[PDB]
Design a protein around this ligand. Sequence first.
Ligand code: MG
Ligand code: MG
Lengths: 383, 383
Amino acid sequence: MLSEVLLVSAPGKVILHGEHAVVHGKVALAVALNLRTFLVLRPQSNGKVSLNLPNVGIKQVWDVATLQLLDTGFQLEKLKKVAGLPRDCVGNEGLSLLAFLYLYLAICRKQRTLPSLDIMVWSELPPGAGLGSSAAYSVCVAAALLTACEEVTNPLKDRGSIGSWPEEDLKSINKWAYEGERVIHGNPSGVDNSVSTWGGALRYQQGKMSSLKRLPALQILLTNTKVPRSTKALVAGVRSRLIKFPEIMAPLLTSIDAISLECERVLGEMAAAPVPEQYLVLEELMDMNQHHLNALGVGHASLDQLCQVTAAHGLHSKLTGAGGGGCGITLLKPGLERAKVEAAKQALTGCGFDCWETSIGAPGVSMHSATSIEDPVRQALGL
Amino acid sequence: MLSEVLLVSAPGKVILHGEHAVVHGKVALAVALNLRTFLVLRPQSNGKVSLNLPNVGIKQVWDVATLQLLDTGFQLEKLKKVAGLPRDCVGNEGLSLLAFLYLYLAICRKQRTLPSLDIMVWSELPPGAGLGSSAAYSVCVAAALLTACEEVTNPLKDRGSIGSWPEEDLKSINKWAYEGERVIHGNPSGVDNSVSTWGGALRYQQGKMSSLKRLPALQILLTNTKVPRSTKALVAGVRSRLIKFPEIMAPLLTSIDAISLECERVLGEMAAAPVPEQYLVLEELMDMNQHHLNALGVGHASLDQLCQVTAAHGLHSKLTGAGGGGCGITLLKPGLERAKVEAAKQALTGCGFDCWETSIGAPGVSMHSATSIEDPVRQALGL
Ligand SMILES: [Mg+2]
Ligand SMILES: [Mg+2]
């Protein structure tokens, strides 16, 4: 067990290419989004484990005593049924406390005595926009507990600035993160928590994942049209259009599959020396994938709008994820012109959108010294 | 020879589907556009053949005497070299008088004596927008002369209202029309003059043409962004993008090919009983072909604009032809709402565009009684 205060953070995810085509067996590329989730673990002298989620403004508290006398025994792992009474509240983020409490017991079981902790979670990630926030959250929770119970090595065992876990350690964090995702999503594929853990880019096709080895630095603009949407609804639509127009749609999905592939190849060639001409290839891949998604019928007025304003300032974009609203990605290559992107952000904001100037192909589960944290995150977490 | 005054008209053409994909062997559908070209032939007592083109404000005049003593002898048919001196002016529409004079001699040769005529040509077709105006013009010229020299039957031999030539007659008109197209375009495929002659819809793939047998009534909105463009330039671009991204582009062109095919099939099923749901299939085929053309890189701001305003009023559209400017097609199905299309036209006009509410799948070479002509065309032709 550790006595030190832990501060870990995991990034979000966004589909660069391959969004709807993955359901039909094509390749897709997911990448770490640098809108991180932060978690602060503070050991407690008292005997109560307390979880705090400022955003969803909720902070439940349990006492080691009670939990201590839990008949822990580690279709569907019914253990959840038990855990349901073992605690007491419910709601949207209700499964979040249920995922925690499950990570807590399951992980701190091997501990002679349940430790008294204090967790503070705050993310820059917009909830519900399909940016994988609950994976980043689970990854952050599994990382903090594992390190606390020293089930995994401690990246800041050198008092360094920022640190990460070694491969065999990361594999474990990701294994537990998947559990938490299972209690909250029941049937997650493992891409979200995988992206959140390893960071970078991830190839995904038919259950098979791979981390693109080399990946360049990508600056984008994340835009949330805040337009609600049904994921289930869009996928069904594509499924339909596919049944309705088989010979038109089959080749189209093959075309998207080729975009993800091409992109993957180009990215690997940029990881070497980022020639300016290679950014031109990506912008084109983004324009094309965006048109193909429109052909798939998953576009939206808010999205053609984001793209129209963006091209109005010379930037390229595409929706990311489900489409029909949600978020969009805008590439920002080297050799900008502040005024251009700056005019874009207000233009984008004028439409009633939320716009962030973040990056893609981000790090992954990271441990930070509470001294190398931004003031916003600082005041928020309580540092 | 006839002494009566002749009034023939031929429609223009527009690619419903298949625009750039035809170069790469895919199927394409061309259809008669109801923006007609009118030609008025008046026999003359004097001895001078005079051609008048109000639009291009030019009206040359030759005298039978001179032409009479022409050593007529009927790589490249050098006969044109001769015909060049046999007459005297030159310019843009300079080959037009050269095509005429070539149709005139070549067709009226068998005439014991060159007849003295007076031709008046005026079209509702915008020149240079790729709507095949010179084919319609050639078709009109071949029709009028053939009928005059009675080399072909006379549709108004019954003093009827509107008439057309029988198949074997049309085939001839089209054969001569192709000659005139050859002198003006040197290497025409025969689609333009074919569409202008038979009217309706035309299937075209790899030199092989076919007339779709049954075809429904289609109401559209023709919009000319008046944005200049290089046809040679766009095709090369596609050729390039195709070389650059072979696996992405091949399937895309296969996808467009499937759209033209599907459409052809649907049209044939509408020729029966036009169920409202079938117009929904076309709008979708139009949305998809429009996105694919954007993927091909032949789109333009003026075109995304035409489509944006159009969808803003619930209508569907796609560029037609070269893209990168030029004209766009907007489908207008049964069960409109005047205000909708009406708001669209001004909206479209507001953008500085020329908008027509015409139709597609039009008639073809037709002979009209100078009494069943619109006043605009009336005052214009001099009737
Ligand atoms: Mg998630
Ligand atoms: Mg023509």
